[PDB]
Design a protein around this ligand. Structure first.
Ligand SMILES: Nc1ncnc2c1ncn2[C@@H]1O[C@H](CSCC[C@H](N)C(=O)O)[C@@H](O)[C@H]1O
Length: 184
């Protein structure tokens, strides 16, 4: 399966630290610690950072190798995180509605197929608590912001879309990104 193949190596988003956009949300107090879900969590850096800052954290990813490596990191860093193999489009089998204070999405929405985009937003909306926060980080230009807005505004109250930086292993390193903050 494609995502098993990418985690045979180190893809360009697979940095050795959490994304600064999410870490800044924690360090500024914009996010208050709570029950958090990291969808498409990859090798777990953002989920582990959330857990080290007092969140009760679950991470889900399709790729068993990413989940296994994420568990290894959690053990290495003496942090408790529930890392599970699973499909975000089947979360009605894994989580309840209204369960999570925080859902973070670091590059998952970016790779959801256009056919499944509406189903994706419904699953995310379902597991977010009333008044919870969905944070979605993706690559940015002008139409990138317009499609984020059109995709999420039916189901979510959009709080903001913010220009931020994204760390990567690419040869410019720091790239341009958009951060969506939204509630239900
Ligand atoms: N339907 C799906 N359900 C759960 N995870 C998925 C998925 N489709 C793709 N993914 C996962 O989504 C991730 C996007 S890459 C982002 C990885 C991680 N959040 C990071 O910032 O490093 C990949 O790890 C991929 O395996």
């Amino acid at each position: 399966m494609f995502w098993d193949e990418v985690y045979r190596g180190t893809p360009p988003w697979d940095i050795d630290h959490p994304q600064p956009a999410f870490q800044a949300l924690i360090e500024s107090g914009e996010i208050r610690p709570g029950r958090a879900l990291d969808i498409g969590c990859g090798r777990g850096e953002n989920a582990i950072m959330l857990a080290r800052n007092g969140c009760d954290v679950t991470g889900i990813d399709l790729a068993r190798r990413a989940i296994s490596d994420a568990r290894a990191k959690a053990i290495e860093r003496h942090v408790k995180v529930n890392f599970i193999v699973g499909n975000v489009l089947e979360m009605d089998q894994l989580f309840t509605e209204d369960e999570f204070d925080i859902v973070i999405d670091s590059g998952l929405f970016h790779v959801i197929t256009d056919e499944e985009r509406l189903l994706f937003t419904r699953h995310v909306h379902r597991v977010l608590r009333e008044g919870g926060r969905y944070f979605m980080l993706c690559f940015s230009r002008r139409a990138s912001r317009a499609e984020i807005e059109s995709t999420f505004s039916p189901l979510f109250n959009i709080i903001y879309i913010r220009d931020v930086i994204f760390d990567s292993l690419l040869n410019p390193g720091r790239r341009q990104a958009y951060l969506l903050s939204a509630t239900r």
